[PDB]
Design an enzyme around this catalytic site. Structure first.
Site, short mmCIF file in Angstrom:
data_model
loop_
_atom_site.label_atom_id
_atom_site.label_comp_id
_atom_site.label_asym_id
_atom_site.label_seq_id
_atom_site.Cartn_x
_atom_site.Cartn_y
_atom_site.Cartn_z
CG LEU A 184 43.56 37.75 38.36
CD1 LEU A 184 42.18 37.17 38.17
CD2 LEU A 184 44.55 36.65 38.67
CB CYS A 185 39.15 42.04 38.62
SG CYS A 185 38.92 43.27 37.31
CB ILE A 186 43.29 42.15 42.93
CG1 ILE A 186 44.69 41.76 42.45
CG2 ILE A 186 43.20 42.27 44.45
CD1 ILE A 186 45.79 41.92 43.49
#
Length: 156
Positions: free
Chosen positions: A82-84
């Site tokens: 999950l790309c922050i």
């Protein structure tokens, strides 16, 4: 390693209704989280395992977040990246909020995105919810009863 350790002790002192953290015994640079699926959403009974890996530099580089649990969400990739950049205390509570409001811009996992679109445009009312209820059921299977204790409990 020092802010980390303060934040860490901060969190162990201040248990959250909707996530457990703990240090990866094997790897110091990783925390094991379980974040609970937001109530009154498809993720209702969740408990989703994931890893926060802090890079060597951390504060300078952002922490990476990867789900252990299979997830069904348009913004989480099939491998659980999950790309922050979308939206630690804050970061987890943000992810919880995102579960119930997919971001239609980066469609990390295409199948989940299609599936959500289909729910929204009333093309298919059954899949997206049931694909989530699947990941919810699976999550509890994969969850030690020690773990399941912690949560509903620290809800009083």
């Amino acid at each position: 390693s020092r802010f980390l350790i303060a934040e860490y002790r901060h969190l162990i002192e201040n248990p959250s209704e909707n996530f457990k953290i703990s240090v990866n015994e094997k790897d110091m640079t990783e925390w094991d989280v379980i974040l609970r699926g937001p109530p009154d959403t498809f993720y209702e009974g969740g408990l989703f395992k994931a890893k926060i890996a802090f890079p060597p530099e951390y504060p300078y580089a952002p922490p990476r977040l990867t789900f252990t649990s299979e997830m069904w969400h348009p913004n989480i990739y099939s491998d659980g990246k999950l790309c922050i950049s979308i939206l630690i205390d804050t970061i987890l509570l943000s992810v919880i909020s995102l579960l119930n409001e997919p971001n239609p811009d980066s469609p990390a996992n295409v199948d989940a995105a299609k599936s959500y679109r289909k729910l929204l445009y009333k093309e298919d009312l059954e899949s997206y919810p049931m694909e989530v209820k699947r990941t919810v059921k699976k999550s509890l299977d994969e969850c030690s009863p020690e773990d399941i204790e912690y949560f509903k409990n620290a809800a009083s």
